[PDB]
Design an enzyme around this catalytic site. Structure first.
Site, PDB file in Angstrom:
ATOM      1  CB  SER A 214      35.948  26.358  44.233  1.00 50.93           C
ATOM      2  OG  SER A 214      35.039  27.304  44.788  1.00 50.93           O
ATOM      3  CD  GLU A 347      39.196  33.112  41.180  1.00 52.85           C
ATOM      4  OE1 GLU A 347      40.385  32.372  41.117  1.00 52.85           O
ATOM      5  OE2 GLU A 347      38.324  32.632  41.322  1.00 52.85           O
ATOM      6  CG  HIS A 467      35.427  30.668  41.228  1.00 49.71           C
ATOM      7  ND1 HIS A 467      36.784  30.375  41.798  1.00 49.71           N
ATOM      8  CD2 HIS A 467      34.574  29.989  41.913  1.00 49.71           C
ATOM      9  CE1 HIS A 467      36.621  29.635  43.027  1.00 49.71           C
ATOM     10  NE2 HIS A 467      35.212  29.334  42.887  1.00 49.71           N
TER      11      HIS A 467
END
Length: 566
Positions: A214, A347, A467
């Site tokens: 990230s 995600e 994610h």
């Protein structure tokens, strides 16, 4: 976050403190560093492995008092032996579970782990830069435990860096020496320490791999882009992010005054006076108010964070980003190192809690104008050309007559991750020596083993690979548990740490010693490819065309008349 999850978290924090104690040993050891000797300690894992642990190694001066908002300086060396048997605090931040500010300004530390301190051969060094939007995170072992990687013969290093306004305040006035990016500068300084010290822990200074997820991915990419870090490492892995993601960079020069005013500042919008107030405030007051800085218009236009990486308005000694990341890709030394990049298979499932609170967000998809890349869109997003670009996105993601939460979340996968990845790949191919880039897609779904970010995204009971879901298979965390060796989860631990270690070692992620890889022929992406190939990692490992390719090319078509901005 719910009172329920707060109490369960409190009980896990108590449980982690007792388990951390229990897994400590009496085997202290001393290693050399260029700043003096450090004392580490051997620790145990729930899999009955062991490793040497050095925590709290300073890579810069504590950035307190006058050093607040400034580029890091080298730390002061010591006589004797510094105790590195315990962790230091994390950077000042809002704790995502409790909602209270925690951490300390004294946070510029790294931790070093290895199963063997005098290996007979020098080992690959993996450096992990944590995510959390540049506003949360840490190298504490309750979140990023080295327990899985230390099954392999590597050196693992987990760094910290300044977060939020304390890391990313930026002021135009050149007199004041607050150009921005203090937190990225921290990471540069950490990489310099690692280059010149990893040998003391059994590491090979000529084989260093940086990786992050990230904001950590966007950070690793910045580390590959800036001239400051040229030749400091040899491979990079970008997990769910890069530096041209729309959340990864913001022009926040105006926002310092706003933060100052939320915090009680009285006076004019002038940089000198605003800084003088911000330098005196309590750090926990600034970080607590950060969440109110963005205007309604900014949030509308999908600015996610008020302070973050920025283009520095003037170039000083330690300048990291002198121009836009797109521009930096053109001369980036890191285009010429072996690279791996990837995303998870859903995600945008991460936005589940943002949609829960605000169901009106789903109506943005009736035109999708708010998701047109900000560089192409008009300020009000009413231009007919903005409506036309929005239509293109809308056709990529709206499946019925009315948009759904799922169309919203799928759209988010692309806006925040896959489309920037596409943009970066195509830019990079115009400026590279021909070193390979390899793509993966993390598509392994389980709820038998989890990490704390599932609590943050209200992801309990939610099917699909969000994610952050891959982090569970790389790092120990205080919600983990010992899994049977034949379990799908344990195999995925072995595969992920095996692939990462293989790549770190050779610059090629393939090995036939990884179970599940026997039919994999994993080629890098070429400039002449029209369709991307990736390793799809699920219960099986399978080379496939990226399923997201069609939606990606539809995003690219927004630029049909603005090819120069692509």
């Amino acid at each position: 976050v719910s009172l329920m999850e707060k109490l369960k978290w409190k009980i896990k924090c108590i449980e982690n403190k007792f388990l951390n104690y229990r897994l400590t040993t009496n085997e202290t050891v001393v290693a050399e560093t260029e700043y003096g000797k450090v004392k580490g300690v051997k620790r145990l894992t729930v899999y009955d492995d062991s490793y040497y642990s050095f925590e709290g190694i300073p890579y810069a001066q504590p950035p307190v008092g006058e050093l607040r908002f400034k580029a890091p300086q080298r730390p002061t060396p010591w006589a004797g032996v510094r105790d590195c048997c315990n962790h230091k605090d994390k950077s000042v931040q809002v704790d995502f579970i409790t909602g209270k500010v925690c951490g300390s300004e004294d946070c510029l530390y790294l931790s070093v782990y290895t199963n063997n301190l005098n290996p007979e051969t020098k080992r690959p060094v993996l450096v992990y830069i944590h995510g959390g939007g540049f506003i949360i995170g840490e190298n504490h072992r309750d979140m990023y435990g080295p327990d899985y990687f230390i099954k392999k013969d590597v050196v693992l290093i987990n760094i910290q860096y300044r977060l939020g306004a304390l890391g990313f305040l930026s002021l135009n006035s050149e007199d004041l020496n607050v150009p921005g990016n203090a937190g990225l500068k921290d990471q540069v300084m950490a990489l310099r320490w690692i280059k010149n010290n990893c040998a003391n822990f059994g590491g090979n200074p000529d084989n260093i791999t940086v990786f992050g997820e990230s904001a950590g991915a966007a950070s690793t990419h910045y580390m590959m882009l800036t001239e400051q870090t040229r030749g400091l490492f040899h491979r990079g892995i970008l997990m769910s992010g890069n530096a041209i993601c729309p959340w990864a960079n913001t022009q926040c020069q105006h926002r310092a005054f706003t933060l100052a005013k939320l915090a009680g500042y009285k006076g004019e919008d002038n940089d000198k006076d605003v800084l003088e107030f911000l330098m005196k405030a309590k750090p926990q007051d600034l970080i607590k108010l950060e969440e109110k800085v963005l205007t309604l218009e900014e949030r509308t236009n999908k600015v996610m964070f008020p302070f973050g990486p920025t283009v520095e308005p003037y170039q000083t000694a330690d300048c990291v980003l002198p121009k836009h990341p797109r521009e930096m890709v053109k001369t980036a030394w890191g285009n010429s190192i072996p690279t791996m990049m990837g995303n998870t298979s859903y995600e945008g499932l991460f936005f589940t809690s943002i949609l829960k609170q605000m169901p009106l967000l789903v109506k943005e998809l009736e035109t999708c104008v708010n998701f047109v890349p900000s560089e192409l869109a008009d300020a009000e997003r009413t231009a007919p050309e903005t409506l036309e670009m929005g239509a293109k996105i809308k056709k990529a993601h709206v499946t019925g007559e009315t948009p759904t939460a799922d169309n919203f979340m799928d759209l988010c996968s692309h806006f925040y991750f896959w489309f920037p990845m596409h943009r970066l790949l195509q830019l990079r191919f115009n400026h590279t020596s021909g070193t390979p880039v390899y793509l993966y897609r993390f598509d392994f779904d389980s709820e038998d083993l989890i990490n704390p970010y599932r609590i943050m995204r209200s992801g309990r009971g939610v099917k699909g690979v969000s994610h952050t879901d891959e982090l569970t298979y790389f790092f120990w965390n205080q919600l983990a548990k010992r899994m049977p060796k034949e379990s799908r989860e344990y195999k995925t631990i072995e595969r992920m740490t095996g692939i990462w270690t293989q790549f770190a070692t050779t610059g090629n992620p393939y090995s036939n010693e990884i179970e599940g890889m026997e039919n994999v022929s994993w080629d890098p992406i070429e400039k002449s490819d029209e369709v991307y190939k990736c390793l799809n990692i699920s219960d099986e490992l399978k080379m496939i065309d990226v399923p997201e390719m069609g939606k990606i090319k539809q995003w690219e078509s927004m630029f049909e008349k603005h090819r120069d901005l692509f």
